[PDB]
Amino acid sequence: NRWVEKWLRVYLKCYINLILFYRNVYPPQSFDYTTYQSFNLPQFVPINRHPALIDYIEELILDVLSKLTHVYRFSICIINKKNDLCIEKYVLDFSELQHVDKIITETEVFDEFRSSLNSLIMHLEKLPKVNDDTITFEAVINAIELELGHKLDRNRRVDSLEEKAEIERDSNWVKCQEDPKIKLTSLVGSDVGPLIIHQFSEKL
Amino acid sequence: MDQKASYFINEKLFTEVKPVLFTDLIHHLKIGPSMAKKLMFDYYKQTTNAKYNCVVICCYKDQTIKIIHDLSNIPQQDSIIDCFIYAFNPMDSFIPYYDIIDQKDCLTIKNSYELKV
Amino acid sequence: DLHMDALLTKFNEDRSLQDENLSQPRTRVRIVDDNLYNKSNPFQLCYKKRSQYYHIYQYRLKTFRERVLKECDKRWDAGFTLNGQLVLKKDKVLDIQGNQPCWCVGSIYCEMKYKPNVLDEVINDTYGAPDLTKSYTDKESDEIMLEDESGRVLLVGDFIRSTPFITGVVVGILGMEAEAGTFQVLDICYPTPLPQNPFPAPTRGKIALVSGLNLNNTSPDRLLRLEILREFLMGRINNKIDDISLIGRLLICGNSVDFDIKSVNKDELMISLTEFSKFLHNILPSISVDIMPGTNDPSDKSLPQQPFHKSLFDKSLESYFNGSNKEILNLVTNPYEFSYNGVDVLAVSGKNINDICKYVIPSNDNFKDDIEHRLDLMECTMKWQNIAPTAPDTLWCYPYTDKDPFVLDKWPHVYIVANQPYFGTRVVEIGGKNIKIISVPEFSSTGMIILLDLETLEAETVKIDI
Amino acid sequence: KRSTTTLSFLIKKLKRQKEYQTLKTVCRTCSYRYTSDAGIENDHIASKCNSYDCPVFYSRVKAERYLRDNQSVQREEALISLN
Numbered sequence: 001n002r003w004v005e006k007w008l009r010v011y012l013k014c015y016i017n018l019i020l021f022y023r024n025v026y027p028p029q030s031f032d033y034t035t036y037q038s039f040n041l042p043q044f045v046p047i048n049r050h051p052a053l054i055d056y057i058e059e060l061i062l063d064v065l066s067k068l069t070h071v072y073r074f075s076i077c078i079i080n081k082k083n084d085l086c087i088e089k090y091v092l093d094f095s096e097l098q099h100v101d102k103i104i105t106e107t108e109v110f111d112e113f114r115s116s117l118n119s120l121i122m123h124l125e126k127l128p129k130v131n132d133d134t135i136t137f138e139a140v141i142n143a144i145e146l147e148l149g150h151k152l153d154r155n156r157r158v159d160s161l162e163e164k165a166e167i168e169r170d171s172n173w174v175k176c177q178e179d180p181k182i183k184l185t186s187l188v189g190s191d192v193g194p195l196i197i198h199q200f201s202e203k204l
Numbered sequence: 205m206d207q208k209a210s211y212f213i214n215e216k217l218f219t220e221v222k223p224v225l226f227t228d229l230i231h232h233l234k235i236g237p238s239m240a241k242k243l244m245f246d247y248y249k250q251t252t253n254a255k256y257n258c259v260v261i262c263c264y265k266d267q268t269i270k271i272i273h274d275l276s277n278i279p280q281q282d283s284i285i286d287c288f289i290y291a292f293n294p295m296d297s298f299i300p301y302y303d304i305i306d307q308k309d310c311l312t313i314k315n316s317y318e319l320k321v
Numbered sequence: 322d323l324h325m326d327a328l329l330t331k332f333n334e335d336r337s338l339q340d341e342n343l344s345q346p347r348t349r350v351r352i353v354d355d356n357l358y359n360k361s362n363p364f365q366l367c368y369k370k371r372s373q374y375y376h377i378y379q380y381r382l383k384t385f386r387e388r389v390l391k392e393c394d395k396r397w398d399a400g401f402t403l404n405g406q407l408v409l410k411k412d413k414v415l416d417i418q419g420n421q422p423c424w425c426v427g428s429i430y431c432e433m434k435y436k437p438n439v440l441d442e443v444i445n446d447t448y449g450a451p452d453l454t455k456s457y458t459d460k461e462s463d464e465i466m467l468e469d470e471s472g473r474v475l476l477v478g479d480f481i482r483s484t485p486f487i488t489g490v491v492v493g494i495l496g497m498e499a500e501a502g503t504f505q506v507l508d509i510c511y512p513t514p515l516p517q518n519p520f521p522a523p524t525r526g527k528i529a530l531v532s533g534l535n536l537n538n539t540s541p542d543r544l545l546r547l548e549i550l551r552e553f554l555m556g557r558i559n560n561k562i563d564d565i566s567l568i569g570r571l572l573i574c575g576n577s578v579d580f581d582i583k584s585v586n587k588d589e590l591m592i593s594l595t596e597f598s599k600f601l602h603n604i605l606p607s608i609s610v611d612i613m614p615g616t617n618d619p620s621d622k623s624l625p626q627q628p629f630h631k632s633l634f635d636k637s638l639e640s641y642f643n644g645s646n647k648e649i650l651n652l653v654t655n656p657y658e659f660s661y662n663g664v665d666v667l668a669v670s671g672k673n674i675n676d677i678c679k680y681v682i683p684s685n686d687n688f689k690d691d692i693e694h695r696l697d698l699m700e701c702t703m704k705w706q707n708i709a710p711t712a713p714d715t716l717w718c719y720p721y722t723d724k725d726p727f728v729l730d731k732w733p734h735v736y737i738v739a740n741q742p743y744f745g746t747r748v749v750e751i752g753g754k755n756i757k758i759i760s761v762p763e764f765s766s767t768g769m770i771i772l773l774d775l776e777t778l779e780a781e782t783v784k785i786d787i
Numbered sequence: 788k789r790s791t792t793t794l795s796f797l798i799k800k801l802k803r804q805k806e807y808q809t810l811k812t813v814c815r816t817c818s819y820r821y822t823s824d825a826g827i828e829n830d831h832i833a834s835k836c837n838s839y840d841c842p843v844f845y846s847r848v849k850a851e852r853y854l855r856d857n858q859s860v861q862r863e864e865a866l867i868s869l870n
């Protein structure tokens with residue numbers, strides 16, 4: 001957790017921004033290609049410049065990093081708005097992540113991130129174009145041993161910003177279930193020492 | 205060699221998704237630019253399963269270098285002095301990456317001075 | 322005329338595959354700088370030493386007046402008669418009164434109002450800037466005076482109209498008073514011609530002129546163009562070593578990185594400098610590199626910008642910065658005079674001409690933002706022997722003491738002004754000497770590089786699409 | 788060999804210098820009302836204005852004091868690190 005958090009946050013930011021841009025979740029005019037977005041990105045990743053969207057993405061990534069000790073799968077679901085049905089699912093496996101109980105040069109980490117993001121972009125390019133006008137996205141995680149929404153039964157008298165952040169992050173999730181022609185396409189992840197991440201995608 | 209180069213290009217194009225340049229062949233096989241361009245052209249053939257985008261550039265007269273985009277209407281075809289394949293792009297946006305390269309023995313032109321330590 | 326595959330088959334299948342031994346690579350032509358260690362770099366100042374414009378103005382006025390008086394004495398010497406009568410010498414502006422020709426020396430006074438865009442830019446970043454347009458509209462114009470410490474006279478006529486002028490420039494007006502305190506203009510004298518080094522007749526190589534790299538974290542196409550330039554300079558693309566090996570040196574003339582200094586942090590600038598260092602390390606073993614500070618580069622806002630630093634570069638370049646390896650890498654002051662194989666070339670990043678062009682002058686009725694107008698401005702800069710006519714804009718406090726380096730002391734063989742919107746070359750004959758003026762365009766947009774021959778002084782352009 | 792602290796030093800110094808240049812340009816443009824001049828002797832006259840009713844004067848004098856401030860020691864530190 002020394003340098004793992006920063007690289008993981010950068011990778012999550014690149015992943016979310018690429019998925020938003022290439023699936024037309026937000027207008028392409030609001031995205032710009034850049035390498036610095038308060039962190040040196042491994043590539044020229046198109047990052048949205050809407051302040052509310054940036055804050056939302058950063059908060060979600062921080063929450064996921066906080067809960068990383070108990071979550072083994074992070075998914076961004078693409079759901080239509082005419083009906084609440086998921087049409088595309090991108091799964092980011094976290095099978096123990098090779099957690100650093102006790103850390104490697106940044107160059108190889110960025111090279112592996114470049115390979116994984118290039119695989120993701122190559123998969124996304126061949127997908128059919130998605131129309132504008134109310135296509136939206138959704139975030140779902142798969143947990144091992146946790147229970148959220150139950151930390152507000154003691155009146156949670158906050159004292160500092162850390163306690164308020166913990167309370168708001170515990171209460172910002174709801175319980176969901178596991179739920180044809182589902183097509184599974186495995187992608188390229190990172191095989192570096194500290195970070196062992198597997199990438200998946202779903203269609204239909 | 206048409207075998208090591210093809211294997212390296214296939215690896216760098218499919219195993220680790222990254223655009224491959226002819227300069228990559230120059231640095232890997234320790235060959236001159238002309239041999240690298242010929243090997244790239246050879247790999248362009250025998251490609252019944254085409255799963256990449258070719259980035260081709262041509263050299264005009266008056267020392268002008270252009271990147272072909274339209275691929276249908278190339279202006280001033282009579283003034284072309286050279287045309288080759290610059291890279292194989294597995295994605296749509298080229299956007300390559302550049303790193304530190306040790307040109308110990310792959311240099312075709314060297315400056316008159318030598319690095320003194 | 323044919324499909325792309327046909328051209329690829331025609332060109333690639335007939336590859337030469339010759340002369341590429343790769344064990345004995347062709348040696349680049351040797352190009353040296355005679356000013357690497359000689360003495361007294363005029364533009365090398367001390368930042369620690371640090372309004373002082375009064376002394377600079379006095380020195381400039383004295384030197385220019387002395388030179389113009391010498392030229393006038395050479396040209397308008399006693400005994401020179403006009404068509405009707407003899408011309409007299411007048412020391413003060415008030416002595417030119419009569420129906421006889423006469424000449425006097427004084428500074429030129431013009432309006433030179435600021436452009437509205439500059440006014441808006443400075444107003445938006447001051448927090449209390451007044452309506453500066455009122456300063457120009459209250460006066461509500463188009464005239465030129467001649468100030469020589471005794472008054473001013475209006476310079477009417479036609480010879481004075483067809484010449485661009487900047488305030489503070491002294492001249493040798495020779496005319497006739499006609500009907501009022503307005504003085505006609507018939508001939509104009511400039512400072513006496515300066516010495517020039519002899520042309521080194523003789524083999525000889527060329528030098529590449531590139532400026533305006535503008536390495537930004539938002540535009541990746543500029544990185545592609547820089548990589549293509551790196552490949553072309555190494556002979557990987559042209560495949561004609563017999564011509565590539567003649568390019569002795571590469572010259573970057575500023576604007577390596579583009580950023581907003583008002584809102585910037587260390588990380589993104591460090592990323593850009595690491596990219597620049599990667600390019601340098603990948604190009605240094607094949608060719609020598611000379612780097613110049615730019616207007617938007619991380620160097621002093623004034624015009625005499627000192628060399629960058631030994632730092633701000635990757636650790637892979639630490640071998641070149643040990644001090645012994647200066648012929649392959651050299652960081653230099655923004656204005657400099659390279660003695661390339663005896664060919665003295667003066668290089669300016671273009672801040673002076675850019676600062677002159679931000680003024681709207683209600684004069685010179687007989688170009689608007691054209692290459693010809695800027696070329697005429699540069700020619701006037703050589704004529705006036707003043708690199709920076711607009712001292713309050715380009716120059717800073719304490720340029721020097723009693724000897725301003727920006728006043729020319731020796732005309733160079735080749736004059737370079739970089740970071741210009743358009744490219745253009747023009748040779749001018751001033752006092753029997755020949756100076757070549759080169760306008761280097763920006764590389765970020767229309768990324769042309771100028772190949773200057775050191776044996777015949779011909780500038781050929783190389784254009785890279787993307 | 789240090790590209791972190793020196794880069795911040797240059798960032799601060801260049802921001803200060805550009806702010807000072809903008810203030811001087813504004814003062815020169817305002818003094819054009821009286822001087823009707825653009826070159827030298829206009830900025831010299833503008834530098835002698837001591838109007839207490841305009842914030843630009845306060846900003847200009849603050850910037851001038853800050854240029855002559857301890858930044859001289861900061862420049863010396865940069866010189867030592869560069870060497």
Ligand code: SF4
Pocket residue numbers: 813814815817818833836837838841842843844847
């Ligand atoms: S008064 Fe305010 S505005 Fe007028 S010159 Fe002095 S500072 Fe500039």
